[PDB]
Design a protein around this ligand. Structure first.
Ligand SMILES: [Zn+2]
Ligand SMILES: [Zn+2]
Length: 87
């Protein structure tokens, strides 16, 4: 991509009551700690949490970073195993 869909991932099984910001911050921090970025700055632009099917869509600033974040399928966040997939 992109294609705009090439900059988004589905993330399932998110902790009930989590906020957009908390999710964004966690992915940003964790992706950076893990070296999943090659460019300076934060990969995640936005998080849209669905009405509440316990899922969200993450939007990334780049197609590369979106791809790298696939590595985080099954990452534990606030006691939950996140399910990460292409949309
Ligand atoms: Zn923050
Ligand atoms: Zn929002």
């Amino acid at each position: 991509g992109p294609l705009g869909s090439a900059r988004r991932l589905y993330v399932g099984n998110i902790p009930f009551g989590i906020t957009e910001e908390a999710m964004m911050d966690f992915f940003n921090a964790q992706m950076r700690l893990g070296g999943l970025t090659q460019a300076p700055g934060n990969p995640v632009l936005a998080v849209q949490i669905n009405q509440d099917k316990n899922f969200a869509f993450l939007e990334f600033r780049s197609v590369d970073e979106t791809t790298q974040a696939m590595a985080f399928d099954g990452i534990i966040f606030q006691g939950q195993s996140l399910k990460i997939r292409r949309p």
